[PDB]
Amino acid sequence: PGCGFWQPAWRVWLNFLRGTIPLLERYIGNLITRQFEGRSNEIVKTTTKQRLDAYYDLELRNSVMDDILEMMPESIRQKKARTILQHLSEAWRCWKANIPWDVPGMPAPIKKIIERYIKSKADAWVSAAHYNRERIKRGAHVEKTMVKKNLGRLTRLWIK
Amino acid sequence: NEPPPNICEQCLGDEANIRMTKIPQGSECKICTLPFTLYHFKTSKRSNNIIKTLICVRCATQRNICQCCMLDSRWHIPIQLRDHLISLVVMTEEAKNDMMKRFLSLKNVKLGGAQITSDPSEADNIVDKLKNILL
Amino acid sequence: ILDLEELREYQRRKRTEYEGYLKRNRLDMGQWIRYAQFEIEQHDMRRARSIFERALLVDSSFIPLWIRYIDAELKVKCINHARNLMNRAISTLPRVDKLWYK
């Protein structure tokens, strides 16, 4: 020990610090802002792997509800919306199982619409599953849970 | 976009030039607890102690008051008193609640009485009535 | 409910509960009418009126709310206000039969 000549190391550290200046100013500054004035209404972002599927489902449900509203007249429709949603869910479940979803009271048009949306879901779902499988085959950052789902989903598909 | 400050004649001072600074979202208004631009002026250059605006312009408009004095824009009387007089010839109920006060502030109805004070028609009439009552 | 303070406490609590239920299902309109009814019962006509107005704002296209509100207005023998309300309703919604009939 006893080698001086700190210059290049020093230079390197200085240059590193340059990058940080900006990052710290956004970060530390942001933190202090929060401390003084702490955020009102943040917006989550579905481009995340997590929450995507749920969001999609919700959207689909909303669409279906809208379609049903468009379809025919109603009085106190809020109550009926829930029922519609339930029906849709049941249909989806049936599809997953490969049970025919035949309900006698369901009127042709509404039923038809529900069927179409479940088909759409299947298309979106099956394709997604396939993609996941492909990824798995490759070795491409699959989530353990995701892989499990794929295994399950794919099994179900096979059974069907 | 921003509206102008409503500072009374006696509030502001006796001179033909005053310099003031505006501080956008300076403080929260005392009534509403909602950010607004502080104007603060020194009256005469050398005369000590500033005169900061304590309320938001909207609130002032609603009550029809000086943003410093907290007195009627017209008659320079405390809000209670001015309103009381009008009643004698209904008064404002500032709702002392965290959320509700803000809502009240944002409403633009001229709370109670303020309308009368604003209009030459109405204020003058009220005054006349008061005079009659007195006599 | 013996004393005034007790009543206030009760009433306040009820109001809070109603608010809580609203905040979630703002677009319900059964809850709103219930709230209005409660207010009426309490004999705070202002509050009830406000609630009805709020409900209307939430869902203007809901005849039941309108009709109940009208009834409430009329119930308290406050006809002129009721009349005004009716007029407003009519203005809002001509092609609904019911308001006119009312």
Partner: protein, 110 residues
């Protein structure tokens, strides 16, 4: 009478149904330009304001009396906009004028 005034018949009536050669003109070029300028100026201004607000770097009269407004340079350490604190605010709708919501005109199946 008031009610009548509030909601008029011509609202329900389509205007083209009587006169077909009647066409709404595509707006005047100059007018369009003017509109663009107005909005462009405004939107630009708004954006500038927003930028100013963001915490990252990069005259008047009252009554008869004349009054000079200033903006003092606050210290760059202290919070720029010391007023604001991320407050929740419910707003009233404030819809004084009444929207006319106009319209026209087997239950066991549906």
């Amino acid at each position: 009478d008031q009610i009548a005034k509030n909601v008029k018949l011509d609202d329900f009536i389509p205007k083209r149904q009587s006169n077909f050669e009647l066409s709404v003109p595509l707006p005047t070029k100059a007018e369009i330009q003017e509109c663009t300028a107005r909005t462009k100026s405004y939107i630009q201004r708004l954006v500038n304001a927003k930028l100013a607000n963001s915490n990252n770097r990069a005259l008047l009269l009252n009554n008869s009396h004349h009054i000079e407004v200033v903006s003092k340079q606050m210290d760059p350490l202290l919070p720029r906009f010391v007023g604001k604190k991320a407050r929740k605010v419910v707003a009233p709708t404030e819809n004084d004028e009444v929207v006319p919501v106009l319209h026209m005109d087997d239950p066991n199946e549906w």
